[PDB]
Structure 1
Amino acid sequence: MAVQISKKRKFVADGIFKAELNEFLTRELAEDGYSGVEVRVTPTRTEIIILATRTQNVLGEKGRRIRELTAVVQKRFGFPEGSVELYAEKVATRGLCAIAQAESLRYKLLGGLA
């Protein structure tokens, strides 16, 4: 109805949300090996999967980082309470993730390697 946004604007909005979420995670989990983000959004609650090489890092001590990131994305995008979760998964074959290798090369060059 009137409250609902049109499908044309709607599907553009979801692409905007994914692009904005990817950029935020790219800047934050860069040194942690962030590979990509998968968003399985459902009408009831959405869910966000973070693809990173070093999962025990994206999840801090007792999962403080993930709880923070879950709260941080909750406030920015106005998600309703308890309707969004963040999962962290290890990406298989990290040598075939161009993002992971490019981030690894960035870290090596910043270290001082030739």
Structure 2
Amino acid sequence: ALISKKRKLVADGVFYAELNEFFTRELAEEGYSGVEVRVTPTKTEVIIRATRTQDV
């Protein structure tokens, strides 16, 4: 459906790349270490687990 399989199953890998800076680029003082990797359809479950889950 307008997005192929072989050439864009690596396209989800930007959501290991765009995302794993987006958590900690303004927030480099946060303390991120790799959350329990998780997904549901239509929406993504979000849990924080870091040094600074309190001040921000």
Aligning the two structures, in what range does the TM-score lie when normalised by the shorter sequence? 0.5 to 0.7
The answer for unaligned runs of 5 or more in structure 2 is none
Larger radius of gyration: 1
Q: TM-score, normalised by structure 1?
A: 0.38
Change (3 A) 1:19 1:37: farther
Q: Structure 1, residues 65-108: CA drift from partner, whole Å, max 9, x if none?
A: xxxxxxxxxxxxxxxxxxxxxxxxxxxxxxxxxxxxxxxxxxxx
Matched with 1:105 is none
Equivalent of residue 41 in structure 2, options 28, 40, 43: 43
Separation in 2, partners of 1:20, 1:42: 19
Q: Shift in Å at residue 12 of structure 1?
A: 1.0
CA RMSD of aligned residues (A): 2.2
Change (3 A) 1:18 1:38: farther
3-state secondary structure, aligned to 2:25:
helix
> Which structure shows the higher strand fraction?
1
Contact 2:35-2:47 within 8 A present in 1 as well? yes
Q: Percent identity?
A: 76
Q: Number of aligned residue pairs: give it.
A: 55
Equivalent of residue 28 in structure 1, options 26, 29, 43: 26
Please tell me the residue identity of whatever aligns with 2:31: G
> Which structure shows the higher helix fraction?
1
Please tell me the residue identity of whatever aligns with 2:22: F
The answer for unaligned runs of 5 or more in structure 1 is 61-114
Q: TM-score, normalised by structure 2?
A: 0.61
Runs of 4+ in structure 1 over 4 Å off: none
